[PDB]
Amino acid sequence: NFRHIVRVAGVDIDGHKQVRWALTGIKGIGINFATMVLRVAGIDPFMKAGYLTDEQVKKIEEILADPVAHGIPAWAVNRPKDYETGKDMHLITAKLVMAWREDVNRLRRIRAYRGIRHELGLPVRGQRTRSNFRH
Template identity: 50%
Template structure:
């Protein structure tokens, strides 16, 4: 497990280029979630496009948003008063 990145091709590694060090890494267990959170927080901090989309809760990877993914508050139908 220690030299996993040396024995596999780069396309099998789940972090091919680290943001901070530039080396290829393969993360296991809870490291995956913590580094993902750190990456999202960095994107929010530097105010890049993806970070802003994460902040506002919108789609990040270019999906369409006009008709799909409509979650949240719903508008109900009111009955006519007699």
């Protein structure tokens, strides 16, 4: 009845653990957002994963797909007010990295201070670099 490795979208997790910590292994999903997902799904976050039916897996992934439609609040989401769509939306794993890269690249394209700092490999948020930031 019990499994040792469950496979949520793309990523695999540890069934010996609780679900809120096992889902923490998908980049883009923390403990808080995992708790929210499980609550909107109807699952105790204290049960050892592995006792996770394909029923529940499918429900979780459909949730993750469109969270603001299932009632996940718009403020508790990764990417609100996307540049070209509005449409407060959420991104995990393979989509996420590309968004980071595209943001930094559009900062680089208009020749901005932040993009130049990203290029050179230096700080961006106003820190002082004389005594620290040693490689």
